[model samples]
Target: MVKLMIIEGEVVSGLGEGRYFLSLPPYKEIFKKILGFEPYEGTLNLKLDREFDINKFKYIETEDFEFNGKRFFGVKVLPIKILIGNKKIDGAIVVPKKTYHSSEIIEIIAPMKLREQFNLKDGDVIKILIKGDKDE
Candidate 1:
């Protein structure tokens, strides 16, 4: 059976990052193929109202690559759909191999600027729906 996970969170500011990683050729190309569009420059930070396990969804691990003499580690992505005002936008929950934050905060990437497209603010409540396999 198809399973859906609904998570409610509030918009928050991250370290003002992810653009550099998302803009990389390797990641950008894969993102297009998976998301059906190139993700925006940066991510939208969403602080969950309650704690949840990050591994609950199916993860698509990005391909590892080398960049600027440094080996770029792969990222784990969870395909997701953001719900806003009766509209569903394609997005993904991306997690770097090394991260400082916990599961309480999630980073979402979409084709458009989610903040402007959805008129979202720092404290705006957003609902995210993630479809996953039953066994996942």
Candidate 2:
């Protein structure tokens, strides 16, 4: 199925802390159960230059989880297909319930290292399709 709306952005760099967070045993298990895949230990950032309203798409809401005596905020993930040129990649835009990332950014995760898989680099722009769409 194809959607009329395309969510796209430029590739960017981040603190790389998401890799650590994704590595957490509990968090990994949560993703596997909810998203159907355990995330790769790293994340790729994209700059949309505009806020992607969560209200626009259907997403999976996760529960708050505790780890290392610290309470980690739950996340809302929107399953989407990455359009790396004509090649398609299965992944999701993962965002925390509480985050300091105020700018227009998307933290993308997949089963494998997307950068290495697609030879991606910073400043590379890409488009995305929500896993499924019902409207024009």
Candidate 3:
């Protein structure tokens, strides 16, 4: 089932699965914070083939821990913070960190709203317009 959340600032809710499903307001807030304008929210829809298994993520959990004083977590649902069209899509990259800089195709997965708008299908040939910023 799809969900949504309204956030003020930092999400104080314990980081876990289902926590971000409803983080809609936070996404909107982030957009306004970064863009300085109120923009219409995008809806994400995911199109997965029968071969793709949603159950694979049934055990997914956003694991969090402290690293060198600051804390961080492994992306359970949204692994990578993506900046697309000047907006952040809760998603992740395909390549591993070690292979991040290598000469290869940069693949990215979009969030629910994006998937819906684009009507994306599995194995669909999509393009990532270079946003001018290098991979950090």
Candidate 4:
């Protein structure tokens, strides 16, 4: 069984102020529904550890890193960096425990249709929404 963190955050708030979230199982499901097919298309933007203070909020960012000797998706996780915010730090692509038995391993199983739409052919990046809570 794969264990993954279901992160819910705020990207843009509307009148209702929706939340940004991603769960391993659901991410795949939503993609199917939206694209009217299977598999998720687009760069997978993953957010890792971050530093947020109470006084101010900063944009989330991710960076390409060296795993030393670890491998993901059958390839050595190399540094192909992309940052979200200029100031934010400590975030990157996570295969999610749901996909890998070892932290170094990443196995993504998606339907053929969804795979084509996203143009995912290893080392692809996609963005996940992150929203914060609001008080009424």
Candidate 5:
């Protein structure tokens, strides 16, 4: 049996610039290493009903690396199973070293565009299930 932790959130609009970071070669390589595949060209933004910190979740932490001469840090990756309208998908929650918002918002990266794939809108509620790793 798998132990699962669930988080509830609602789809939200972002600054429309998630693709720029996802396309960065440094982040791409790291994501591929952690997720077993390159992330989608963009991210799906979710706003939690309450402030939820990613650090509280079980995750794989990546070491800080420099990108374009700037050192980057505090990147965390957590495998997540997302269910939408009877369809399930594999994805990861990505926490950056630096962010403009607080814990209320999260960015998800998957192999495909989540919005289009799930026919989701800006206010659709989503439930993400996280599986505990062996160490847990």
Candidate 6:
């Protein structure tokens, strides 16, 4: 079944943790294979108007691994298409196993810097289409 879910959220600021994580070689390699793109060095943060019911759709949760003798948390990703007006960009919602944001907030990852490419800023409202995870 190809279930589709829609999410409307406003751009928000993050603590730059995602950026730091993405810069790491360990993170970059794993995400590149799963997302089918080299994830940008930073992530776009979004704040939903209401709580998102995560149980409604399937997601990919990566397993944690050790690097440099330190344990790193894995992230959950769900592929999606971001919509800004009539334009659409291929991206995904990414959630680290360890985070400080509430369920109302989410992080987005793409092959490029979405903020600059899309010309978006904090408080900009955008819509995203969450595609059902395919497992065959």
Q: Which scores better on TM-score, 1 or 4?
A: 1
- Candidates in order, TM-scores: namely 0.83, 0.79, 0.28, 0.20, 0.79, 0.81
The C-alpha local distance difference test score for the whole of candidate 6 amounts to 0.76
Query: Which candidate, 3 or 5, would have the higher lDDT against the true structure?
Result: 5
TM-score for candidate 5, please give it.
0.79
- Model 5: number of backbone collisions: 0
Tell me, by lDDT, which candidate is best.
5
Over the stretch 57-129, how does candidate 1's per-residue lDDT look in tens digits?
A: 6676666778678887776777788898789887887777565655577778888898887777798787898
Task: Flag the better candidate by lDDT, 2 or 3.
Answer: 2
TM-score of structure candidate 6: 0.81
Model 4: per-residue Cα lDDT at residue 32: 46
Candidate 6 at residue 81, lDDT?
Answer: 90
All models: lDDT? 0.76, 0.75, 0.33, 0.30, 0.77, 0.76
The backbone clash count of each candidate, in order, is 0, 0, 8, 16, 0, 0
Candidates 2 and 4 compared: the better one by TM-score is 2
Model 1 vs. true fold: TM: 0.83
Residues 1-136 of candidate 5: C-alpha lDDT, one tens digit per residue? 5466777888888865553465668877888888888877777788876776666667778777677779767677887888777889889887765556666777888899988877788988988877763444
The candidate that wins on TM-score is: 1
lDDT, candidate 3, 50-98, per-residue tens? 2221122222333354534765444322233433335555443222212
Model 6 CA deviation exceeding 4 Å by range: 16-19, 53-55, 98-102, 133-136
- For residue 80, model 5's alpha carbon misses the true position, in angstroms, by 0.7
Local lDDT at 74 for model 1: 71
